């Protein structure tokens, strides 16, 4: 017999002691090696309730990524309130590695294997595992990158869709590549992101169709963010240690859903910023100018964060804007199928 419980997890990874890359360095002293022979036991005739929105595994992962970033990033200036810290800011090696989350003795992780499980409610295909799959701690906004895919249909996740303050996570079932480049090609901060418009617009139309099912067949319209810091109004992510800000207006083009020119490549204008707002909470940091040469990163778009416009208007349509409420929601997007229980 078991019951829902929280406990201190530990992490496992394939980090290497010879690697200078900062995730590897953190995971070398903060995690144990990955289980060579992972065991998963499918529990016959067991129904179990999950709640991805109230899952302490998420909070624990959050604290790890905060500690990782705190020990790794080296901005020229750290700013907090009135406190200013100038320090050396050498260019670092930055590339997230998969981190596994594991239970200690007396506990186990239950895992929902229902293919269209939305994150809350009963799960009828439950297995037990010692460790999660490897999750890359990718810090990004608007788009979820390099994550896992929904196995069957596109899944809409929300604690409550009627509640406009609750984050919506759209889980894709097919990846769309996003190809970002700061060319060696003169504005050194000017960059761009290329997306296959045919692939993307097909997926985005699929997303709108799934949103329709959850919102009483109302018309689904996208709009750009109404306000916020640049990390919010733009697709924000890091590539090779550099902080990228990409304009996603073209990525949510209502004309290309439901006619001429939407098949070509979508090019998003981007900027690399030296001065950023810290996602850990309150704080500003300034980094050195971008590294020389071509800066390039290809990522998989595997999810979208959305916010729905609140308030009451005679509604033919619901309006959604890219961006979610919280960095922890990124961890939720991967941890949704897991729950810790205590063995009795």
């Amino acid at each position, epitope marked *: 017999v078991w019951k829902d419980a929280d406990t201190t997890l530990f992490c496992a990874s394939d980090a290497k002691a010879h690697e200078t890359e900062v995730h590897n360095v953190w995971a070398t002293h903060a995690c144990v090696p990955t289980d060579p022979n992972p065991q998963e036991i499918h529990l016959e005739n067991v129904t179990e309730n999950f709640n991805m929105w109230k899952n302490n595994m998420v909070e624990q992962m959050q604290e790890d990524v905060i500690s990782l970033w705190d020990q790794s990033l080296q901005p020229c200036v750290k700013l907090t*309130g009135g406190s200013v810290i100038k320090q050396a800011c050498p260019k670092i090696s930055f590339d997230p590695i998969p981190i596994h989350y594991c239970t200690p003795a007396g506990y186990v992780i239950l895992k929902c294997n229902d293919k269209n499980f939305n994150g809350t409610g009963p799960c009828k295909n439950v297995s037990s595992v010692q460790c999660t799959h490897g999750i890359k701690p990718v810090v990004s*906004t608007q788009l979820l990158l390099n994550g896992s895919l929904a196995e069957e249909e596109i899944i809409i996740r929300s604690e*409550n869709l*009627t*509640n*406009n*303050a609750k984050t919506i996570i759209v889980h894709l079932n097919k990846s769309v590549e996003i190809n970002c480049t700061r060319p060696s090609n003169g504005d050194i901060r000017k960059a761009y992101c290329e997306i296959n418009g045919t692939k993307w617009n097909k997926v985005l139309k699929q997303v709108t169709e799934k949103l329709k099912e959850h919102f009483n067949n109302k018309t689904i319209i996208f709009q750009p*963010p*109404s*306000g*916020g*810091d640049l*990390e*919010i109004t733009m697709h924000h992510f890091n590539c090779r240690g550099e902080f990228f800000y990409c304009n996603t207006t073209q990525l949510f083009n209502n004309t290309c859903i439901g006619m001429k020119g939407c098949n070509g490549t979508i090019t998003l204008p981007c900027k690399i910023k030296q001065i950023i*707002n810290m996602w850990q*909470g*309150t704080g500003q940091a300034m980094y050195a100018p971008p590294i020389d040469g071509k800066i390039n990163c290809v990522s998989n778009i595997t999810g979208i964060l959305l*916010t729905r*416009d*609140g*308030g*009451a*208007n005679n*509604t033919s349509n619901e*309006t959604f804007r890219p*961006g979610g*409420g*919280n960095i922890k929601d990124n961890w939720r997007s991967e941890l949704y199928k897991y729950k810790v229980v205590q063995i009795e």
Partner: antibody, heavy 121, light 105 residues
Framework: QVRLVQSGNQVRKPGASVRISCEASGYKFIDHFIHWVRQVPGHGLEWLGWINPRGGGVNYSRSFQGKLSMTMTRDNFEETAYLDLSKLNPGDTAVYFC????????????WGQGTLVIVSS | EIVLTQSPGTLSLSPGETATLSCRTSQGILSNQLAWHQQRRGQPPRLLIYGGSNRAPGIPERFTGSGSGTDFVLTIKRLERDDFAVYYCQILEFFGRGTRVEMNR
């Protein structure tokens, strides 16, 4: 105790702007949305929108789109939220409240004391 | 939109009596999604009940929130002078039009 203290009553001509502040205290500012609500004298409460201090993201009520030009901002260091109303019309004469949900209940509003804005020629 | 209907619009009761205020919703809601507020004239609103049935700190025990599904109730026992006020229910971003509790004599 959670407390929201707003700036003082204002008088504006049509076409002008007003910026209302909402100073929070008694809690960790960045962990709670700030909402704004208006109440025309003699009428009921109408939600305007919220701001998320973590990033400054906002949600503006569809009911006021095209009818009220508003901008919500915040200063996390000063733990203050701001409501900026531009291009005011006489119909914008109202009391404006900021609010914060009770802990664990984002829509169970705890209220600021309100700011009266008069718009008149 | 969740349509909230408060009833009655006005109550006239003697001090000492019990006020029963209703908030009815067009669709079933969750209890946590509802709040009651009190507003005395010329004053800001004050949170009374959060999450449908939880009395806010400092709120007197004579104020009690109950209800479920589509019908929520605020009951005020032993009405005192300061209780004669307007009461609003809130569900998510939506507010009822209010019930005014007035003093009978």
């Amino acid at each position: 105790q959670v407390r929201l203290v707003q700036s003082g009553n204002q008088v504006r001509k049509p076409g002008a702007s007003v910026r209302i502040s909402c100073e929070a205290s008694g809690y960790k500012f960045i962990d709670h949305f700030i909402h704004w609500v208006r109440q025309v004298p003699g009428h009921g409460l109408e939600w305007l929108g919220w701001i998320n201090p973590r990033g400054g993201g906002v949600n503006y009520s569809r009911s006021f789109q095209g009818k009220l030009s508003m901008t919500m901002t915040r200063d996390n260091f000063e733990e203050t939220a701001y409501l900026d109303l531009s291009k005011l019309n006489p119909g914008d004469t109202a009391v404006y409240f900021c609010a914060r949900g009770f802990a664990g209940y984002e829509w169970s509003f705890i209220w600021g004391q309100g700011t009266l804005v008069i718009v008149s020629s | 939109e969740i349509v909230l209907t408060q009833s009655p619009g006005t109550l006239s009761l003697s001090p000492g009596e019990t006020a029963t205020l209703s908030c009815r919703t067009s669709q079933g809601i969750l209890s946590n999604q509802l709040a009651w507020h009190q507003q005395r004239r010329g004053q800001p609103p004050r949170l009374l009940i959060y999450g449908g049935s939880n009395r806010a700190p400092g709120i007197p025990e004579r104020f009690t929130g109950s209800g479920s599904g589509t019908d929520f109730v605020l009951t005020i026992k032993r009405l005192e002078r300061d209780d004669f006020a307007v009461y609003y229910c809130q569900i998510l971003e939506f507010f009822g039009r209010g019930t005014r509790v007035e003093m009978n004599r």
